[PDB]
Amino acid sequence: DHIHRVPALTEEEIDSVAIKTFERYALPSSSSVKRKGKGVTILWFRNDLRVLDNDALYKAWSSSDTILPVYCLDPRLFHTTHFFNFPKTGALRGGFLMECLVDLRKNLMKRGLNLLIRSGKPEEILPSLAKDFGARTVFAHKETCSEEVDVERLVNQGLKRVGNSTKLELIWGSTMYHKDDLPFDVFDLPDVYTQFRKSVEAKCSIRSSTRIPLSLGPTPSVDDWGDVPTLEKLGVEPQEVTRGMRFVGGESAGVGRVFEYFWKKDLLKVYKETRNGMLGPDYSTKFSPWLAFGCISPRFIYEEVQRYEKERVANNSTYWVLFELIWRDYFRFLSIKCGNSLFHLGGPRNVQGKWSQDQKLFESWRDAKTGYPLIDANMKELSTTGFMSNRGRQIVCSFLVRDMGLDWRMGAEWFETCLLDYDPCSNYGNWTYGAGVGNDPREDRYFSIPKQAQNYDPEGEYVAFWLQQLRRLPKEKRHWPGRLMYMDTVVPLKHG
Ligand SMILES: Cc1cc2nc3c(=O)[nH]c(=O)nc-3n(C[C@H](O)[C@H](O)[C@H](O)COP(=O)(O)OP(=O)(O)OC[C@H]3O[C@@H](n4cnc5c(N)ncnc54)[C@H](O)[C@@H]3O)c2cc1C
Ligand SMILES: Nc1nc(=O)c2c([nH]1)NC[C@@H]1CN(c3ccc(C(=O)N[C@@H](CCC(=O)O)C(=O)O)cc3)CN21
Secondary structure: OOEEEEOOOOHHHHHHHHHHHHHHHEOOOOOOOOOOOOOEEEEEEOOOOOOOOOHHHHHHHHOOOEEEEEEEEOHHHHOEOOOOOOEOOOHHHHHHHHHHHHHHHHHHHHOOOOOEEEEOOHHHHHHHHHHHHOOOEEEEEOOOOHHHHHHHHHHHHHHHOOOOOOEEEEEOOOOOOOHHHOOOOHHHOOOOHHHHHHHHHHHOOOOOOOOEOOOOOOOOOOOOOOOOOOOOOOOOOOOOOOOEEEEOOOHHHHHHHHHHHHHHOOOHHHHHHHOOOOOOOOOOOOOHHHHHOOOOOHHHHHHHHHHHHHHOOOOHHHHHHHHHHHHHHHHHHHHHHHHHHHOOOOOOOOOOOOOEOOHHHHHHHHOOOOOOHHHHHHHHHHHHHOOOOHHHHHHHHHHHHHHOOEOHHHHHHHHHHHOOOOOHHHHHHHHHHHHOOOOOHHHOOOOOHHHHHHHHOOOOHHHHHHOHHHOOOOOOOOOOOHHHHOOOOOOOOOOO
16 A cells, blocks of 8 residues: 555645644733843753744743743664664654754744754854853753763753853753642652552542743744754655655644644544554554654643543543553653663663673564564564554564563563654663563563464454565465465564
């Protein structure tokens, strides 16, 4: 078949939906906020590429009279992964990022601002801009993992080294439940998801999304706002989606997908019954890439769900989308409690010894040549589109770790290279769980390829779509085609 744009909306539809959505959440009046004499501030964007429900943007605006929005294309983002040195950012996510930047500049311009784009390290670019424009502060969202917090440290020290006079203000964001509202400090986050969930749902409230004014200007006088970099300048060979889902970067496209899934298609009311699907855009929200880049936020999604429940229907599916967003919150907070044990072979559980790093075995998994259609189709979906269904990710993870016996980080780093929605907290969090090195032993499980195939792809419709040489075969053969109609198997399945 062809490439399915996600969202499937036309460029005009995306623009009108974005306008209506921005309109719906616009700040009624800026009456009560005085900006006179507050000076210049720099807003440093990272993975919060949106205008809507952006607390850093709001705080920057309300504490200044002029804002200089900046995005730094950090050279380290295009180097290599930590342990196995795969590309740090694969071509597909890189392409999605560029679309996100183009859209952010466009949306900032609509509110009277613009986005200064520079290529280089934030700790070198920001202190320089702060001095040049006499900014009193640099606002940004707080991140949680080692690499990102190290950059925060370098930027903070860079600003001090040019004087006091300039402060880095990090704002908590990204989560549906706010860190400050939790019924426990993250150091004491429950190691069992169910307990974390029951606690926040019983003792916490979700904050309303932050309303942003329609007028946010002016910016300082800038001679060159910068071109959006090209992947080629960054040393990445562009790659386009040849088949399947083609996700469209940017906040505009993101709110367009929320509109598309919830309202236009009215699929939210059946979400829970379909979320284990693997084929097509319809089986789940597909919000992950926009959430990862911060093109959309969970507080916004929650308010849309509330409106849906009021106007259309409230049931187990409308609630389940929130259940899943809580999983995202959980791994984000867990990243703080775990620190770098999140990336260590033994994981947070600080487990065992073992594991092979057999390059040949790994490559067969990576290149979709394991000989098992269920596995191969998923790995091909990933390298072709930068996305994989949640069901598929759990399965390929179990296969790599349990059937192939490989160092789980090889799989985690490959996902890091390929996923449009790559998020360290969620990626490594879910990998530690699947690998059995997280701190909830009740989640340690082996996925039977035959059973999974039977339960989630009975007609072999999914593997057939991705592995066209199986399309002619009847089911039964689709999943056990044999070595001639398909290919040899690289390893026996660990469980009979
Ligand atoms: C090995 C492995 C690696 C993963 N890597 C990532 C990753 O790098 N980034 C990422 O965002 N998700 C990751 N996931 C979680 C989950 O598979 C994806 O969020 C989901 O497939 C994204 O598609 P969706 O938006 O249609 O999902 P939906 O089912 O529509 O869920 C809605 C939202 O809930 C959140 N969510 C749902 N399930 C999970 C989960 N298990 N953990 C965390 N958040 C969840 C996401 O933000 C998602 O967009 C991983 C899962 C596994 C098993
Ligand atoms: N977005 C993102 N953020 C990250 O921080 C991150 C990724 N992705 N991808 C995976 C890598 C690997 N992660 C790691 C892994 C190990 C240490 C580590 O062992 N640190 C030592 C101290 C420094 C040293 O001696 O190496 C430690 O004792 O914790 C740090 C970060 C950070 N990683």
